Design a protein around this ligand. Sequence first.
Ligand SMILES: Nc1nc2cc3nc(NCCc4ccccc4)[nH]c3cc2c(=O)[nH]1
Ligand SMILES: Nc1nc2cc3nc(NCCc4ccccc4)[nH]c3cc2c(=O)[nH]1
Ligand SMILES: [Cl-]
Ligand SMILES: [Cl-]
Ligand SMILES: [Zn+2]
Ligand SMILES: [Zn+2]
Lengths: 369, 369
Amino acid sequence: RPRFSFSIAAREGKARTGTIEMKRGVIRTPAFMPVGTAATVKALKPETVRATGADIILGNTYHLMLRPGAERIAKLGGLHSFMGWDRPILTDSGGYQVMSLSSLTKQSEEGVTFKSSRHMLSPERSIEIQHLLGSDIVMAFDECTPYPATPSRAASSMERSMRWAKRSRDAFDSRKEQAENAALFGIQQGSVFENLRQQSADALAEIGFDGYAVGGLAVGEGQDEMFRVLDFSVPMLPDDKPHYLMGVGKPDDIVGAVERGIDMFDCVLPTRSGRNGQAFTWDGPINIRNARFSEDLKPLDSECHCAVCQKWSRAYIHHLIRAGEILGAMLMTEHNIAFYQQLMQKIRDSISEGRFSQFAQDFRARYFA
Amino acid sequence: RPRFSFSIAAREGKARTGTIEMKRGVIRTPAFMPVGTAATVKALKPETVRATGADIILGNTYHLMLRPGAERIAKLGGLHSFMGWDRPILTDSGGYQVMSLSSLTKQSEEGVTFKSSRHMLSPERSIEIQHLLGSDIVMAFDECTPYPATPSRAASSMERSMRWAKRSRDAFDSRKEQAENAALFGIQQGSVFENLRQQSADALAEIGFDGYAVGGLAVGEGQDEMFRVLDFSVPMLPDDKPHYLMGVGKPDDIVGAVERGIDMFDCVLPTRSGRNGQAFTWDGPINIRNARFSEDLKPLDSECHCAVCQKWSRAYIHHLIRAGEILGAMLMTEHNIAFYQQLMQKIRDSISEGRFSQFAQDFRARYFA
Ligand SMILES: Nc1nc2cc3nc(NCCc4ccccc4)[nH]c3cc2c(=O)[nH]1
Ligand SMILES: Nc1nc2cc3nc(NCCc4ccccc4)[nH]c3cc2c(=O)[nH]1
Ligand SMILES: [Cl-]
Ligand SMILES: [Cl-]
Ligand SMILES: [Zn+2]
Ligand SMILES: [Zn+2]
């Protein structure tokens, strides 16, 4: 098995489908990564995550460095062994979460100091933490520019991120075992500004990465604006490497992003909203807590192939979620993650068959009916 | 498959091992029933409950009549279909839970009126609710005498329970489909008083039941007293029918109760304490939240055959429970229920082999070391 090999099997417009081969497994693209922030995809055993179709999951440098700790996880055998997921794991670098979740932060050229306990993150420390975790796809340490931002503020922020991208590249390359067994992705910044996105793409390509994330989106800009930025931003990235849209998103966001050349996604929506009673269906989301479901014997979704829809009724799941029962969170989450994976499968198949445009149209007409 | 057939395969002293054959499955005795009060064994899919070795689970008339409702469950196809457990279910009659959980209660010869919403329970209504649920083993509607009680108060209480036992018998027998497909257990009362326990046993035997529960224990009396009462109470029950000790208990309680002739048990301890961080092991319970487990790579128990102990470390489960993660509750609960089932299996095998006395001694020496 290779360290990292991306092959594009088919295209339709800007959309691509293919595979990333890595030592711990193959990732089918476009891919959705369930989020496992605290070394667990919430309410699911890893075997269940796999059974839904997931090829890779996401972990977080920020959360794990605090609890249970990076050195501790390494001492225990690495993140894969610790949580019982033996397939690829992508870890975010901490750059977004530190600014989102920390009470106090101090930003400088060196990195970010923060209070959880006082800690520091820098390109070097982030790469080392991800090494200790045993991440298969390592993200460069970046700065997610707040939205909105003035052109000048976006520029200075993006430029720092690019300097941090080079430092990330160097730290990764200095660690032989990491460079031989893992991959490193760069993160494009530049807010909503075309010239800055271009400068960022140029800087990242000059350094060279295994894949390229579009950072700084899904930060409150809304779908229209996100799509507008993707329209010009994705073509700036190297065509022959994967394109990863961080933190996206709703099913319609995913479809539109694939139409614009994105290959990889992660989002807490299916897990979090599952726990909250929202189930995804081909006819749009439903809230299972609604009284209309109290005696509904149909499964959550009429076409869904998941184990939950094969066995339990809306009425039962309605009862569980109303009662605050853990099994309710389990079943809703398994269904939602399975729904997301089936969406990705339909996307892959339709691109492979040259009918993705029709799929996107059919999907939207029904989902938003 | 027969409606209800109890066969005793082996004995040692007062202990027995055997089988109850019912239409939905065989129950190996002595048996432990996981508790599924809200139509779910908390944090476990039914397939997982079965994988641990459970032959039968317990449901509750009181909880289900309130939420989601007995007529509703019947309309949806019955409790088995609703929750996805196709094997036997025993339902308590509501007599204990109504007095334990209701804010206001009014007791009379007719039954008990209570506030959850105002509701009523009587022998007739209880049997009908259990019919609507589709219970395989139906409990008579009784009164659990508070502890301590004066001899006279215990007597009047037990006598009412016996009148209610006859009414339960008659209501059950009047419902052809229930009488043909389910079994009915009577419940012995009489507090801690030998003469009252005898009068209760005589009354129940005169009426005739498929099995006999020892009621009115595990109500704060402590193990020494519970064992003292079991010493004289169990021999009063018909030898050729199952003996069910309601609400018991800790592993040592179960072993001692089997030594005294009990065949069936139910308790929330393995599930509830699992969620709270207590794991059962052959060397006694441990609290997985304790810092001493933070880097412990051993499984919860060194001998346990469960899926949790085959895959995950104490260190990981410690992290999950500390983090408030749902997977922590899932794994702890699966292990604890599996532990209880392995205890029952060891009990059955040792009685079968005529070495139960030695097992009880060995178990206690190690568990309490
Ligand atoms: N390193 C790095 N990580 C990121 C994570 C993100 N996540 C998002 N969006 C998440 C939005 C969101 C929040 C709650 C529920 C659903 C979706 N945007 C993000 C941007 C970045 C980024 O620029 N750099
Ligand atoms: N119908 C009926 N049901 C009962 C349920 C019981 N449950 C118990 N004990 C439970 C004690 C308990 C409580 C919390 C955690 C563990 C154990 N004693 C019980 C007695 C009766 C009884 O006499 N009649
Ligand atoms: Cl989540
Ligand atoms: Cl429980
Ligand atoms: Zn489903
Ligand atoms: Zn175990």
